[PDB]
Amino acid sequence: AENLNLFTSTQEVVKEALNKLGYDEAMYELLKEPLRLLKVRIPVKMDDGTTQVFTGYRAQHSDAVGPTKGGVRFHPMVSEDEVKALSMWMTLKCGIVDLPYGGGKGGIICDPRQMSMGELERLSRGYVRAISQIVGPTKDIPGPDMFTNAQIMAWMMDEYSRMDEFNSPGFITGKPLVLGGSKGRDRATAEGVTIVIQEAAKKRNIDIKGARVVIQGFGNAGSFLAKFMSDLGAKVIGISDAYGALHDPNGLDIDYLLDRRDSFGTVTTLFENTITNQELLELDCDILVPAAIENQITAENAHNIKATIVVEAANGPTTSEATKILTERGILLVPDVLASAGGATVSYFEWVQNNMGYYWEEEEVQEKLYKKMYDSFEAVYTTATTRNIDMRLAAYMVGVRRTAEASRFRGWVLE
Amino acid sequence: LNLFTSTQEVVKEALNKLGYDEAMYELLKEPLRLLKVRIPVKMDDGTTQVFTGYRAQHSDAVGPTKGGVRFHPMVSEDEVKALSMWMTLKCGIVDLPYGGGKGGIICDPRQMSMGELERLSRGYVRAISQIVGPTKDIPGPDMFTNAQIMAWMMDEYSRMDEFNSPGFITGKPLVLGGSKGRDRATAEGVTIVIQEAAKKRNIDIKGARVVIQGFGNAGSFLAKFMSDLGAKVIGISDAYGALHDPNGLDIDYLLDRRDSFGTVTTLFENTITNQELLELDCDILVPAAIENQITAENAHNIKATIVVEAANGPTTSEATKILTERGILLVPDVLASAGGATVSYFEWVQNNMGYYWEEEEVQEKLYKKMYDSFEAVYTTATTRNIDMRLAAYMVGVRRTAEASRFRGWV
Amino acid sequence: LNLFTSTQEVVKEALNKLGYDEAMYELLKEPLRLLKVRIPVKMDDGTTQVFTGYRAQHSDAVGPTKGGVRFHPMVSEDEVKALSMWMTLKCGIVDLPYGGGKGGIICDPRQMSMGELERLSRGYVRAISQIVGPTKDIPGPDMFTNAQIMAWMMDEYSRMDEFNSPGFITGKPLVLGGSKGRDRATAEGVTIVIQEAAKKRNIDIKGARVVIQGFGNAGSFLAKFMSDLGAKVIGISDAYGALHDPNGLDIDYLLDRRDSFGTVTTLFENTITNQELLELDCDILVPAAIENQITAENAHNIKATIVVEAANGPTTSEATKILTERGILLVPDVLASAGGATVSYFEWVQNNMGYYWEEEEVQEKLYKKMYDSFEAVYTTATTRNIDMRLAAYMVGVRRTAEASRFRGWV
Numbered sequence A: 001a002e003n004l005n006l007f008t009s010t011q012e013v014v015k016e017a018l019n020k021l022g023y024d025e026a027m028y029e030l031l032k033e034p035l036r037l038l039k040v041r042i043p044v045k046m047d048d049g050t051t052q053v054f055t056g057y058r059a060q061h062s063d064a065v066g067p068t069k070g071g072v073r074f075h076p077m078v079s080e081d082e083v084k085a086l087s088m089w090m091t092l093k094c095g096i097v098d099l100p101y102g103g104g105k106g107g108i109i110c111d112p113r114q115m116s117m118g119e120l121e122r123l124s125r126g127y128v129r130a131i132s133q134i135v136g137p138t139k140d141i142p143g144p145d146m147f148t149n150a151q152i153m154a155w156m157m158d159e160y161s162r163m164d165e166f167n168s169p170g171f172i173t174g175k176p177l178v179l180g181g182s183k184g185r186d187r188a189t190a191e192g193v194t195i196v197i198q199e200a201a202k203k204r205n206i207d208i209k210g211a212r213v214v215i216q217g218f219g220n221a222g223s224f225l226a227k228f229m230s231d232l233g234a235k236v237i238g239i240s241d242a243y244g245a246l247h248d249p250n251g252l253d254i255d256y257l258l259d260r261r262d263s264f265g266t267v268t269t270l271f272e273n274t275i276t277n278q279e280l281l282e283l284d285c286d287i288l289v290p291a292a293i294e295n296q297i298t299a300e301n302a303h304n305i306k307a308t309i310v311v312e313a314a315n316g317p318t319t320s321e322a323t324k325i326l327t328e329r330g331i332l333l334v335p336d337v338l339a340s341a342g343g344a345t346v347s348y349f350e351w352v353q354n355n356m357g358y359y360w361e362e363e364e365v366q367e368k369l370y371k372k373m374y375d376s377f378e379a380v381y382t383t384a385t386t387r388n389i390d391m392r393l394a395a396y397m398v399g400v401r402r403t404a405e406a407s408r409f410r411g412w413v414l415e
Numbered sequence B, C: 001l002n003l004f005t006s007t008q009e010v011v012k013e014a015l016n017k018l019g020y021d022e023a024m025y026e027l028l029k030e031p032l033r034l035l036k037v038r039i040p041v042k043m044d045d046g047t048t049q050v051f052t053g054y055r056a057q058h059s060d061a062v063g064p065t066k067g068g069v070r071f072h073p074m075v076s077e078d079e080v081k082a083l084s085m086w087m088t089l090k091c092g093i094v095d096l097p098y099g100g101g102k103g104g105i106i107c108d109p110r111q112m113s114m115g116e117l118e119r120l121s122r123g124y125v126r127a128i129s130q131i132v133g134p135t136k137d138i139p140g141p142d143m144f145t146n147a148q149i150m151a152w153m154m155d156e157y158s159r160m161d162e163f164n165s166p167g168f169i170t171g172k173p174l175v176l177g178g179s180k181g182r183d184r185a186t187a188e189g190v191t192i193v194i195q196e197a198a199k200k201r202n203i204d205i206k207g208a209r210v211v212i213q214g215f216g217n218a219g220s221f222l223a224k225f226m227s228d229l230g231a232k233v234i235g236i237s238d239a240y241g242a243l244h245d246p247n248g249l250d251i252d253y254l255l256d257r258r259d260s261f262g263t264v265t266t267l268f269e270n271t272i273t274n275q276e277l278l279e280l281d282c283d284i285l286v287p288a289a290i291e292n293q294i295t296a297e298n299a300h301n302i303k304a305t306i307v308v309e310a311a312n313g314p315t316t317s318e319a320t321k322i323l324t325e326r327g328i329l330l331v332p333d334v335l336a337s338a339g340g341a342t343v344s345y346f347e348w349v350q351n352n353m354g355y356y357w358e359e360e361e362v363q364e365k366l367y368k369k370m371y372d373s374f375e376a377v378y379t380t381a382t383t384r385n386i387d388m389r390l391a392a393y394m395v396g397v398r399r400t401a402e403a404s405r406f407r408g409w410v
């Protein structure tokens, strides 16, 4: 078999990152588990008047660099291991992009598609009331993640604000603009993924105009990224869905698909001639972008991948043995910790704007975002080729450095 | 020679020339709050040693108070009170929303271990935490404290608070919210004040004759900075002697041959005295050694157009008056060295937003502050026909006097 | 943890590999003599201050002891003891008729006038005169001391003798019997060891690839020397980064962009990291910056045929084993830096004769001393199949242990 546990696999790279950086075993012991993990039971009155109690998680990986940052996930597969690994990745993202953050993450075991608007609101208010003692603008700043959105952020912001007895926009990011959100929040992730595609393309000497790209997933990341790739002149040879995939060697009509895709990012069920997801990962292209879920590139298929570049818009799409197979095959892997930092970057700008009470325009957010994604790409890429290591390990090296140095400076690990 | 009563006389003469009344002096002649504490520390040998600590807050009329903490065997109450007042003047000269603060512990840090200094740093924050914080009173580094001590003090304050409060204290390491451009900021400010004094006397640096006293951290950097401006550095000096070249010294040679303790006179046979170095004919004299170097004894002998004080307190009171009525443009230390307080303030602003500037941006922001402060003091000096030191004190105190009146305290 | 006990461990392992008994380590693990004196000094204010001084004489089996005097607030009895033992090891490595000595005074020379330091210097000679002298124990400069302090101590001792005793003390001004060819003696010494290490590996220096880490005092000097001999210096660095040119970096141009802290990197920002600087493929790597740069994580990837430590402790013990296992010729810092002691010795010899050598003659003799030492350590390391750092230690202790046995002390 292969190790598919998101948590223990992430631990192993962090351990190697910290050893290559020269730290003592105690720094791996301090960073391998979140400093705080709160598990909570949340009762919600359901539309039929009965009560359901939901299990929720809030993980705070490390406090050392500043308040922890990370989204909240509503899914029936939310586990404590996933929430921790997600939380550790947010530490590394924030490090790579140099934010005064540590990593946080949250999750609630629920099926949100089976719940009404009112039930979602009461679940969201309960979650904030359950965890409020350890979160806030100066402690831990949640945000959206898949299946949670601006309306849920608005509800959670409202509930936190009523408890404080004053508006706290800085508690949570991904807010609507009228609630103190930021320009650029919707396209931030895919816009960040587009920048590392362009930078990876330059390394490999691929012209984007005419480049064959394939995208697994058609949600916020996938569908925004397809639009960006399309009117950048790339041919989006295939897009994917929780239910199937589409393939066109001329490149797909992305506008046509965006017009018919639902809020949950599914569009494949409209077509008869579908292709499987395992086929989509394997078709010949220049850029493969996994932007769906975790562990889609494994040991069973990492040899069959034909892209020259694969960039991880999604969290944890490729496994440890896949990364080693890919890098041995000469692929330019751009790890998720790098490629998706665009969403954490813009979420941080939202927070900065909330701290000052003053708000930035699109062009200013885009300007500051591009600087960060550009400079942070060179950092990880230069580290990989200078230490003769794979790109993920190098991104972990770049991302864990601030947290380790802060934990040292503060006295958490001595010597 | 008592610092504190001497500091009071500075405040009194400045409030009096500004036109404020006796009540205003009485409000400002002592800190509003002075906290004396006793900090037990578990020492590495298992005994408890108990240390005396101080935290003075002079006036918070203008904003939270600001000032560093020092660990010295000779720290006293009067020392901390006086320096908190000087911090008030320093902040106002460069127009910060800050009153003056100051702290000290009676200890010999060089005789204590790492673990003892950390435990004493933590116990200090515990002892005073009820009157300090990002919105109340912001400490910073000083004598025998550095970024690591700031880092321990911040961690302690943030644990007490149950959240990160990087704005509690300045001088932090970068990874804890420290500010880029912090190490050079004081010396860069002397560089601006030197170039701004030069324009006031229409003295082009390139080819100008400049002599600097001292060759350590401040003096090395100032001799190199003017030598690359094309200026002729005809004199530099040591604790042991001085060097004189009417054609300009080869600063890069001296720089190369100096030892790690700011000595270089010792290598040389032909050598002139420090007292003769100060009396050299030149355009810019920059004392960067030690105090009471220009006194009533040689004040009529120095023949420089411009005297910028890089050392603290190198010109005595009577010598300052002799210099001004010989037409000499004297830039006081409390203005010349205000780059360090300005960048402390920049660090605290970054902690308030949660957003951090690039070095080029801190420099840009640092330059204007110095350029602006120099002009405020220079204009007050010349409008009121006073020396620039008293004018600097006046610019230093007037915001606190204005704020105290507006808020109803007088 | 602690330097003295760590220095005891070095002497123990060397005597063990040479084959001596536990008695020889019992004789050498502490200095034969250790004099702790109290020195009263009249201060400029008229009060008296009483300072603590130390003089350590490790072993006079081979001859009079030799070692410098430092004036530092952190001087401790264990530090003076340990450094005297290091002076034995140094004097051994370069085969001097000396044993190890050292002194220290607990003071802050930064808070003392020129007159206070002179009176302290004379009071220290007075306080230890009974056990030092040209034929017993020969001091020299060190931290915060210099040729002026050596001139004062030589005068005090001569006054005490009732005749001129220049060989009491080295580092003197030339006009009092100091040596020519002294100023860059340590740096010239590294230069000799680099060339001699290069000829061992049959490497033509005149086209060799040289990487230097550090660009202050030592790095700037070594780079210009290698550049001049025809070597291509393909890398240099400072605290803020590194530069890389595969064909030669053009040192003369970089030495002109230096900023007085030894920084050149900030001006380019087409820069490489320090980590990459150290793993660049080359013939001669020279860490002349800080310490712990070559480590267990680093050492497997360094690509230089030869590594010459021009700083103290830049290679760890773990790393030292690895470079030795990979067949890299490592010159330890305790050997590469022995030129300062060698030229100290030459000053003493000239004092003994009353006859003084030209710069060229001091250089010729320095080269032969450094070549012979390099050859001796290389032969011990190669013959016993051990790393050069342990071999250096062994050459350094060998003479004292052979003399201690011969004279009956064990």
Ligand SMILES: NC(=O)c1ccc[n+]([C@@H]2O[C@H](COP(=O)([O-])OP(=O)(O)OC[C@H]3O[C@@H](n4cnc5c(N)ncnc54)[C@H](O)[C@@H]3O)[C@@H](O)[C@H]2O)c1
Binding pocket: A071, A144, A145, A146, A147, A189, A190, A216, A217, A218, A219, A220, A221, A222, A240, A241, A242, A243, A264, A265, A266, A277, A291, A292, A293, A294, A313, A314, A315, A316, A340, A343
């Ligand atoms: N935190 C954020 O705001 C944010 C934004 C963009 C991306 N991401 C990360 O990237 C990934 C996608 O996030 P999103 O916001 O785009 O999600 P989303 O919920 O908006 O859309 C998910 C997409 O993946 C598809 N999908 C689900 N299971 C699939 C499967 N087995 N095979 C193929 N497609 C499948 C869905 O049908 C939909 O097309 C996640 O790992 C997420 O954490 C996060």
Ligand SMILES: NC(=O)c1ccc[n+]([C@@H]2O[C@H](COP(=O)([O-])OP(=O)(O)OC[C@H]3O[C@@H](n4cnc5c(N)ncnc54)[C@H](O)[C@@H]3O)[C@@H](O)[C@H]2O)c1
Binding pocket: B186, B187, B190, B213, B214, B215, B216, B217, B218, B219, B237, B238, B239, B240, B261, B262, B263, B274, B288, B289, B290, B291, B310, B311, B312, B337, C110, C113
């Ligand atoms: N960057 C700045 O401009 C700056 C910042 C802070 C403080 N200072 C002040 O500058 C002075 C020196 O600070 P530093 O960091 O350069 O110190 P340092 O100890 O690094 O250098 C001091 C220099 O002054 C010389 N010196 C000592 N006593 C002397 C004497 N009696 N006569 C002549 N020279 C003498 C020393 O030999 C040395 O060359 C102090 O008064 C200090 O308060 C300057």
Ligand SMILES: NC(=O)c1ccc[n+]([C@@H]2O[C@H](COP(=O)([O-])OP(=O)(O)OC[C@H]3O[C@@H](n4cnc5c(N)ncnc54)[C@H](O)[C@@H]3O)[C@@H](O)[C@H]2O)c1
Binding pocket: B260, B261, C213, C214, C215, C216, C217, C218, C219, C237, C238, C239, C240, C261, C262, C263, C274, C288, C289, C290, C311
């Ligand atoms: N004052 C003290 O207590 C003390 C302590 C040790 C040594 N010293 C003395 O200081 C002198 C040091 O000479 P030097 O040649 O080392 O010069 P230096 O210290 O003036 O400059 C050293 C160089 O190393 C650089 N550097 C610093 N950190 C670096 C890093 N991580 N990577 C790469 N480069 C880095 C510096 O920027 C500079 O370029 C000697 O005389 C020595 O005896 C004094």
